[PDB]
Structure formats: C-alpha cells, structure tokens
From a paper:
The γ-tubulin ring complex (γ-[name]) acts as a structural template for microtubule formation at centrosomes, associating with two main compartments: the pericentriolar material and the centriole lumen. The GCP proteins interact via their N-terminal GRIP1 domains in a specific order: the γ-[name] core harbors four pairs of GCP2/GCP3 (spoke 1–8), followed by a sequence of vertebrate-specific paralogs GCP4/GCP5/GCP4/GCP6 (spoke 9-12) and finally another pair of GCP2/GCP3 (spoke 13-14). The inside of the γ-[name] is lined by a lumenal bridge composed of one [name] molecule, as well as two α-helical modules formed by the microprotein MZT1 ([name]) and the N-terminal extensions of GCP3 and GCP6 (N-GCP3 and N-GCP6), respectively.
After having structurally characterized the universal γ-[name] adapter protein NEDD1, we next focused on the conformational plasticity of pericentriolar γ-TuRCs imaged in purified human centrosomes. Computational particle sorting revealed two distinct γ-[name] conformations. In the first class, the overall conformation is similar to the isolated vertebrate γ-[name], and spokes 13 and 14 are positioned outwards from the helical axis (outwards conformation of spokes 13 and 14). While well-resolved for wild-type RPE1 cells, the extra densities were no longer present at any of the GCP2 subunits for centrosomes purified from CDK5RAP2-/- cells, indicating that they indeed represent CDK5RAP2-derived CM1 modules. Examining the distribution of CM1 modules on our γ-[name] structures, we unexpectedly observed CM1 modules in two distinct patterns, highly correlating with the overall γ-[name] conformation. In the outwards conformation, density for CM1 modules could be detected exclusively on spoke 13. In the resulting cryo-EM reconstruction, NEDD1 density was stoichiometrically present, indicating that CDK5RAP2 and NEDD1 can indeed simultaneously bind γ-TuRCs at centrosomes. While binding of one CM1 module to GCP2(13) was associated with an asymmetric open conformation, concomitant binding of four CM1 modules to all GCP2 subunits in the first half of the ring (position 1,3,5,7) was linked to an allosteric conformational change that transitions the first half of the γ-[name] into a closed and potentially more active conformation, providing a possible mechanism for how CDK5RAP2 CM1 modules may promote and regulate MT nucleation activity of the γ-[name].
Numbering used by the authors:
A (entry chain R): 8 to 21, 28 to 41, 50 to 84, 89 to 101
B (entry chain S): 12 to 36, 40 to 54, 56 to 72
C (entry chain P): 3 to 16, 30 to 49, 66 to 80, 82 to 97, 107 to 118
D (entry chain U): 2 to 39, 50 to 375
E (entry chain Q): 24 to 36, 40 to 53, 56 to 72
Write the structure that this text describes.
C-alpha cells in the first residue's frame, strides 16, 4: 500500500530510476512545530497570516497531525 | 449515514489543510502526501519531494 | 517440444497413473488461467523490514537488464 | 475412475489419427481410403496393401467429407478395427476442417448418435486443437497436411472464418512434384508404387532452404548438398537440389503452375483480414502444424519471409512444435481431458431433445 | 545468465524446475505461475 502510494506520488511529481531513488530514501511535538511555523512566518514578515494560521490549527483539531505540519513547514 | 458523515469530515479536513498550505506556500499531491504521512520519516519524505521537484526543473 | 517440456515439469513436481493425474490437473489449471517497477516495489518492502539483501537484489536485476521470466518469478514470490 | 475413456478421432485428408483422450499420442494412424473389388469393403492400410485388386475411394480427399457412405465405413473401421472399442460405450471427439459447411457438421452429429449410438460427442476445428496443444488460445495456425493447407487466425479460442484462407497445395502436390524433378534428373518415378517411394524420400531428405538462389548456386558448384537414398532392390540414387526445390513450391507455387500465393504470403493475408487490434498477437503467435510443415528449416524461412512482408516495427515469432505432425490429435486429447470441457459434450439426451442442429450452439 | 536468475529467485523465495520454467517462458507468465501453485497444492 505505502509503496503503491509512493509510486503514485512520483508519477504525479513527474521515471523508474527516480522511483528506485525514492524507495532507497524511504528505506534510509505538535506545539513545538506550531511555534516553529509562527517563527518562520515572523521571519517572512505576515503578522495577520500568523493569527489566521493559529485559528486554522484549532479548526483541524476540532474536525499524525505533527507529521503533516512538519512536511508543510519543510516546503516553506 | 455514518459513512456519509465520515466522508464529509474527510472533505472538511482536506479543505482546512489546503488553506494552511496556501498561507505557507496541488490538492491531489497534498492528498497523496497526507495518506503517506498517516501511514508513517516526515523529514525523509520532504527531502524526496524536493529532489523530485529539482529533477522536473 | 512444448508438450514434452510440460510433462517434464510435472515429473519434477511429483506411479505412471499418478503422473497422468498431475498432468491433467496442470492442463485444467492452464485452461482456468486462459516489470522492473514491480521488482523495485518488492525491494522497498524488504528495505522497510535486510537493507544489504535488498541492495544485492537491485544489483542482480540491473545485471540481467527475460522480462517475462522475471515477472513470473515475482508472481511466484 | 467413473468415466469410460473418451475417444479422439482426427479425420485427415490423407491419414486419420485415432486414440484415447488423456494419451500423449494417437493409438492408430491409417490412410483415409476405402476400397472395393474391381470381405466386401477394405479400409486403411489393407485397402492400400491390396489396392491392386481394388478401386480406391478418398471420401475426405481435401479435408471436407464428400462421400458419407464411405466416411461412415472409415469411422466403423476406426472403432471396431483400429481402436477395438464399441462407440456406443464411449464419448467421441471428432475433428473437422476449417470452413466446414454447416450441413456437414449436422451430418457428422446425426451419424454419431443415430448410426453409432455414441453416448456423447463433440466436434472441434483442427487448427484450433493444434493451437491448444501449443498452450495458446490466440494465434494464427498454418496447417499443411496431405490434400490441403489452411491459414487459420484464432482469437480467444474462436477461429475467425472471415480471415481463414485455403490453399489447395499440400503434401500430395509436393510428392508428385518431387517425382517430376527426380525424373527430369534422369531417374524415372511415375508409377503409384514409385509415388510411395518418393513420398519416403521427401519425408526423409527434403528441407526448406533459407535462401533459394544461394542454395541452388551451392548445389550447382559442388556435391556438398547431395544425399544418397537406397531403393529396396539395392540401387543407391543421389538427391541434390531436389531436396530443397521440392518444398520450395510451398513458397513459390508457380513451380507447380499455380498462381496462388505461397504459405508466407497466405499467412500474411489472413492476418491482414483480421481486426488491426489483434494482428500483433497473430504475428507473435504464428504456429505451424501438419505433416507438410515438418521440413527442416521451414520455421526460419517463414520467420524471414513474414518479416519481409510485415511492418519493420512488428515482432514476428514462428512456433514450430517438435510434435506438430500430431498436434491436432494431441490438442483433442488435451481438450477432451479438461474438467471444464465435460459440460461441453453433446449428450445423447441433448441430441434427443434438440436434434442435429444443436451442434451449432454446442460446438461454436 | 541462468546462474544470475537462480540467485534472484532464491532471494524472492529447484534449479532444475527454474531451468524448465525458463525454457517454457522462452517458448502467459501469470498463467504459468498459477499452474505451478496448483501443482504444489496437488503434491501436498
Ligand atoms: N517429415 C516430413 N517432411 C515432409 N512431409 C512430411 C513429413 N512427414 C509427413 N509428411 C507429409 O505430410 C502429409 C500428411 O500430413 P497430415 O498433417 O497427416 O495430413 P492430413 O491430415 O491431411 O492427412 C503427407 O503428404 C506426408 O508425406
């Protein structure tokens, strides 16, 4: 299942060599992440967006979470 | 009934995640990434995505 | 010939009556029935579970690069 | 085992092959001939042995039954003389030529149930059985026998009648052509007895040259292609370019005064008559069957010739099973032995219920 | 060539059976795998 999902992600991003490299790479808290995101937003500033992000984070909890936030922060 | 409620919750969560991505900045790529993140690590996935983007360029 | 090869395969899997029954079963199975990316996916699962063995398998596949045979092997696995 | 043995009978234009389903080879093979004085009727080898005092009949001369009275005698002979079984006690799988008239299929069915009282029967196309024997359900079969040759495209087990081609050029014509060129060489093979000798020379020393002209040049400037053949009286004769000139007629019928396309061109034409979506499957699965496809070198020659006719991007593969001389019979033995085929037999009950025409629905 | 294929087969999972299977493949693949599994079940 996970391997199939990784192959689908590689296809969306784009071949076989790239998929093999991705497989090799794969083979190779929440509050802190939120604070880091706010600090990154401050560096970018801006302030209004940070307030909106705090409201959005609360909404997600109302409707694992740390891993998704970390990936988004890395993309920046 | 219960299945329909679960589908609505998933759609609402996806919309909220997309808004967060836009602020820190597609939807199909985000859905694939979210499923992979739920299974299991996060830093490694980000590195692979960055490498794939460089290859596309 | 192809028919002779099928009989030889049945004998290896397996007195004369028993061999005939095995051949009939193989023929029935064939009637009922009537690549590189897949190998990489198997390697990724092995790496998650080991890593050295997965690297050797990838190297062997590269050396080989038949395809049909590989596919069959994968299926068997 | 609860079931009695089922019979498999391959009706050939020149030779009939009979045996029991499940076996690897037919138990008997005999000439498709019936003879009466110039014991009242002679069938098979005996008719041939005593042809001197008989008038011979060939009821299935070109693959299609033309005289049912004598065909019935061949079947009687098959059961009681060759296989030594009672037809009313065993299901019978019979083979038929490609493009066999619908009325003939009903006749065969009626004769089995009403004359021989078979408990069950079925009829399958010869080419289809050969394809089955090769482990395939899709492909094109080039069947070359004694009195006729056919190119039969088959997809998912079904022969495609619109694309089937018949070539009235086979083993018999090649035997007579060899008699003719050996006679032109300086020998003399003209009598019926001599025809049998040449047929033997043909089956033992002939071959298909990869390149006709080059082979002719080699034979003209050296004795490297010559082979000796000893007659029963001790005389040893020499066969040279006749070895490959004989079967060359399959590729160039003009050598026989025929305007027909050679076997390679006929195979190509059949494929071209099929839906474009399955042509690549046919090109990649061209199977040879029949005694006349036994010539050494024929597979490589077909590969070369088809490749020249087909698109350069086409993958061409000629399959020549070592046992292709009896692949029709073997395919029947395999089919009749299949678990899923048992429900396909036409039972005496079904025959009594629907009559002869049921064969069209049951044996599509 | 044949030896390399045998090593790959061992990692995925005798030698005579592999050689016979390779010859059959040279002479679809999914159907052959199903037949081998059925034969193993019959032997059991
Ligand atoms: N090894 C061989 N080489 C060439 N021709 C052969 C060989 N063996 C048999 N034949 C020829 O094949 C023909 C019979 O083949 P077969 O498929 O049994 O025909 P049919 O079914 O029409 O009677 C005869 O003409 C015979 O001479």
């Amino acid at each position: 299942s996970p391997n199939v999902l990784l192959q689908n992600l590689c296809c969306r991003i784009l071949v076989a060599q790239q998929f093999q490299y991705a497989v090799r790479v794969i083979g190779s808290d929440e509050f802190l992440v939120a604070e880091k995101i706010k600090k990154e937003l401050i560096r970018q500033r801006r302030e209004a967006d940070a307030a909106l992000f705090s409201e959005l984070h609360r909404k997600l909890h109302s409707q694992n979470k740390w891993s998704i936030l970390y990936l988004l922060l890395s993309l920046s | 009934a219960a299945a329909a409620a679960n589908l609505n919750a998933v759609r609402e969560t996806m919309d909220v995640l997309l808004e967060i991505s836009r602020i820190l900045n597609d939807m199909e790529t985000l859905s694939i990434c979210v499923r992979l993140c739920e299974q299991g690590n996060p830093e490694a996935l980000s590195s692979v995505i960055k490498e794939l983007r460089k290859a596309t360029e | 010939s192809i028919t002779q090869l099928f009989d030889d395969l049945c004998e290896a899997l397996l007195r004369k009556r028993a061999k005939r029954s095995l051949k009939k079963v193989a023929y029935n199975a064939l009637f009922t029935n009537l690549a590189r990316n897949k190998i990489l996916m198997l390697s990724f699962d092995l790496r998650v579970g080991l890593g050295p063995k997965a690297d050797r398998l990838e190297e062997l596949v590269e050396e080989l690069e038949v395809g049909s045979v590989l596919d069959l092997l994968v299926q068997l696995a | 085992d609860e079931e009695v043995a089922a019979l498999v009978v391959d009706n050939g234009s020149g030779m009939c092959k009979a045996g029991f389903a499940g076996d690897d080879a037919p138990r008997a093979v005999f000439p498709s001939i019936v003879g009466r004085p110039r014991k009242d009727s002679y069938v098979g080898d005996e008719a041939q042995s005593k042809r001197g005092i008989l008038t011979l009949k060939y009821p299935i001369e070109h693959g299609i039954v033309t005289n049912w009275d004598d065909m019935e005698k061949i079947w009687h002979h098959t059961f009681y003389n060759e296989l030594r079984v009672a037809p009313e006690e065993h299901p019978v799988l019979l083979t038929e030529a490609p493009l066999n008239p619908k009325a003939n299929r009903e006749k065969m069915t009626q004769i089995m149930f009403e004359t021989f009282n078979t408990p069950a029967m079925y009829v399958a196309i010869q080419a289809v059985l050969s394809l089955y024997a090769s482990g395939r359900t899709t492909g094109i079969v080039l069947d070359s026998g004694d009195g006729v040759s056919h190119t039969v495209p088959i997809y998912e087990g079904y022969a495609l009648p619109h694309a089937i081609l018949r070539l009235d050029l086979a083993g018999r014509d090649l035997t007579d052509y060899l008699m003719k060129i050996l006679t032109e060489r300086g020998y003399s093979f003209t009598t019926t007895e001599e025809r049998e000798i040449v047929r033997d020379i043909k089956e033992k020393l002939c071959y298909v040259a990869l390149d006709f002209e080059q082979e002719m040049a080699t034979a003209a400037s050296s004795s490297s292609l010559e082979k000796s053949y000893e007659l029963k009286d001790g005389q040893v004769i020499t066969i040279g370019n006749e070895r490959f000139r004989c079967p060359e007629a399959l590729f160039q019928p003009s050598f026989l005064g025929m305007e027909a396309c050679g076997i390679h061109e006929t195979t190509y034409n059949s494929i071209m008559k099929c839906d474009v979506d399955i042509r690549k499957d046919l090109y990649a699965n061209t199977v040879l069957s029949g005694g006349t496809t036994m010539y050494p070198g024929i597979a490589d020659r077909m590969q070369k010739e088809i490749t020249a006719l087909a698109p350069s991007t086409m993958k061409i593969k000629i399959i020549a099973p070592p046992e292709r001389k009896y692949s029709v019979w073997i395919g029947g033995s395999i089919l009749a032995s299949l678990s899923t085929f048992q429900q396909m037999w036409i039972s005496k009950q079904e025959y009594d219920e629907s009559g002869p025409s049921i064969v069209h629905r049951k044996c599509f």
